[PDB]
Design an enzyme around this catalytic site. Sequence first.
Site, PDB file in Angstrom:
ATOM      1  N   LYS A   1     -67.585 -45.222  12.323  1.00 56.39           N
ATOM      2  CA  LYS A   1     -67.821 -46.181  13.388  1.00 56.39           C
ATOM      3  C   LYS A   1     -68.507 -45.480  14.546  1.00 56.39           C
ATOM      4  O   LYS A   1     -68.205 -44.319  14.846  1.00 56.39           O
ATOM      5  CB  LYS A   1     -66.525 -46.824  13.895  1.00 56.39           C
ATOM      6  CG  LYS A   1     -65.902 -47.830  12.962  1.00 56.39           C
ATOM      7  CD  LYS A   1     -64.976 -48.752  13.748  1.00 56.39           C
ATOM      8  CE  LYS A   1     -64.088 -49.579  12.833  1.00 56.39           C
ATOM      9  NZ  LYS A   1     -63.600 -50.817  13.520  1.00 56.39           N
TER      10      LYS A   1
ATOM     11  N   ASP B   1     -83.314 -43.190  20.977  1.00 52.71           N
ATOM     12  CA  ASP B   1     -81.918 -42.768  20.822  1.00 52.71           C
ATOM     13  C   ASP B   1     -81.782 -41.764  19.672  1.00 52.71           C
ATOM     14  O   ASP B   1     -80.897 -41.865  18.816  1.00 52.71           O
ATOM     15  CB  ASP B   1     -81.001 -43.971  20.609  1.00 52.71           C
ATOM     16  CG  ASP B   1     -79.551 -43.673  20.966  1.00 52.71           C
ATOM     17  OD1 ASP B   1     -79.235 -42.509  21.299  1.00 52.71           O
ATOM     18  OD2 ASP B   1     -78.730 -44.611  20.928  1.00 52.71           O
TER      19      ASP B   1
HETATM   20  N1  ANP Z   1     -77.043 -45.576   5.874  1.00 50.34           N
HETATM   21  C1  ANP Z   1     -75.938 -44.827   5.957  1.00 50.34           C
HETATM   22  N2  ANP Z   1     -75.470 -44.237   4.833  1.00 50.34           N
HETATM   23  C2  ANP Z   1     -74.377 -43.476   4.914  1.00 50.34           C
HETATM   24  N3  ANP Z   1     -73.632 -43.189   5.984  1.00 50.34           N
HETATM   25  C3  ANP Z   1     -74.110 -43.794   7.078  1.00 50.34           C
HETATM   26  C4  ANP Z   1     -75.226 -44.603   7.152  1.00 50.34           C
HETATM   27  N4  ANP Z   1     -75.421 -45.052   8.451  1.00 50.34           N
HETATM   28  C5  ANP Z   1     -74.437 -44.501   9.118  1.00 50.34           C
HETATM   29  N5  ANP Z   1     -73.605 -43.728   8.352  1.00 50.34           N
HETATM   30  C6  ANP Z   1     -72.444 -42.985   8.811  1.00 50.34           C
HETATM   31  O1  ANP Z   1     -71.646 -43.851   9.601  1.00 50.34           O
HETATM   32  C7  ANP Z   1     -71.375 -43.227  10.872  1.00 50.34           C
HETATM   33  C8  ANP Z   1     -71.223 -44.294  11.923  1.00 50.34           C
HETATM   34  O2  ANP Z   1     -72.577 -44.563  12.340  1.00 50.34           O
HETATM   35  P1  ANP Z   1     -72.978 -45.509  13.516  1.00 50.34           P
HETATM   36  O3  ANP Z   1     -72.179 -46.808  13.409  1.00 50.34           O
HETATM   37  O4  ANP Z   1     -74.442 -45.671  13.420  1.00 50.34           O
HETATM   38  O5  ANP Z   1     -72.539 -44.716  14.862  1.00 50.34           O
HETATM   39  P2  ANP Z   1     -73.191 -43.336  15.263  1.00 50.34           P
HETATM   40  O6  ANP Z   1     -74.708 -43.358  14.886  1.00 50.34           O
HETATM   41  O7  ANP Z   1     -72.501 -42.250  14.492  1.00 50.34           O
HETATM   42  N6  ANP Z   1     -73.107 -42.986  16.908  1.00 50.34           N
HETATM   43  P3  ANP Z   1     -73.291 -44.333  17.930  1.00 50.34           P
HETATM   44  O8  ANP Z   1     -73.846 -45.566  17.096  1.00 50.34           O
HETATM   45  O9  ANP Z   1     -74.215 -44.043  19.067  1.00 50.34           O
HETATM   46  O10 ANP Z   1     -71.852 -44.633  18.528  1.00 50.34           O
HETATM   47  C9  ANP Z   1     -72.563 -42.296  11.083  1.00 50.34           C
HETATM   48  O11 ANP Z   1     -72.283 -41.251  12.009  1.00 50.34           O
HETATM   49  C10 ANP Z   1     -72.803 -41.767   9.674  1.00 50.34           C
HETATM   50  O12 ANP Z   1     -71.899 -40.696   9.434  1.00 50.34           O
END
Ligand code: ANP
Length: 289
Positions: free
Chosen positions: A11, A129
């Site tokens: 998340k 970002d």
């Molecule tokens: N396409 C994907 N495939 C696999 N894992 C993913 C993918 N997108 C995101 N993740 C994982 O899910 C986590 C949560 O991502 P996300 O919801 O985008 O928040 P964040 O990028 O980590 N930081 P932020 O959105 O600024 O709070 C990420 O840090 C990755 O570890």
Amino acid sequence: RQITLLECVGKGRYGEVWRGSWQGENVAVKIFSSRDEKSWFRETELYNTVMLRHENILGFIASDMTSRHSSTQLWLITHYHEMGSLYDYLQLTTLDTVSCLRIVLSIASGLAHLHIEIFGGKPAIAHRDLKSKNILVKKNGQCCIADLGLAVMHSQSTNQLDVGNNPRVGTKRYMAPEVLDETIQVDCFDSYKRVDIWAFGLVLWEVARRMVSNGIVEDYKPPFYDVVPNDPSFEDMRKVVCVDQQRPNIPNRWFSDPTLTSLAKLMKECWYQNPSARLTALRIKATLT
Ligand SMILES: Nc1ncnc2c1ncn2[C@@H]1O[C@H](COP(=O)(O)OP(=O)(O)NP(=O)(O)O)[C@@H](O)[C@H]1O
Ligand SMILES: [Mg+2]
Ligand SMILES: [Mg+2]
Ligand SMILES: [Mg+2]
Ligand SMILES: [Mg+2]
């Protein structure tokens, strides 16, 4: 559309990301809060209206609205990548030169392909970002750039700058000085490209510390770990970046390896306090080749 969620794998501040099944295959499903509809909109916008396919950009599949728990959910469906984000990856593993060059190269390609306009084609796009959590590591060793939810676009033919209406701002830790002191020129597309280069310089430092050179590495640390708290505030980042003008310090173990010496040279040229002096994504891609 008809996809089954199997496990939530993380998340962030704008939604959850699930590993799910579609056609019995692994896809990432980022579920947006309706509180963050504007990022789901902007990402759906780019991926539907721009030919945004490239080895180093998160592959898009579908976008949709659905109903769960008596509430509307905004789904962005992309390629799932087993090994997760660069940020998680750098914490579980150390790198050797051929794997460290493969990473910083791939990010350099992805960013440049975003930054240049192609005719035939795609407008020029700035990310706004970029950071280790918004880069994914793929099974074939290449990294790709995700999260186009704050992207700005520019087309030379119209010379119209498309900035969107998203009130979200960038991850504070990675903001360039011009963003922090609020003197960025908002009408000049190149300004946004220089914000991306600055953050790229920060990502660069993060990667280099984890490359084993003479059996030594630094531990994974986020930029400015030593001067600002976790979840640093807008004014925390300004004091270090704008006023005292600190940059991440370069470990001189890197001067006992040829590559680490080239990346230290790259980084410094990405975080000049003066955005005009910073390298472009196109040089950085070139040098790394
Ligand atoms: N396409 C994907 N495939 C696999 N894992 C993913 C993918 N997108 C995101 N993740 C994982 O899910 C986590 C949560 O991502 P996300 O919801 O985008 O928040 P964040 O990028 O980590 N930081 P932020 O959105 O600024 O709070 C990420 O840090 C990755 O570890
Ligand atoms: Mg993200
Ligand atoms: Mg992400
Ligand atoms: Mg994305
Ligand atoms: Mg987004």
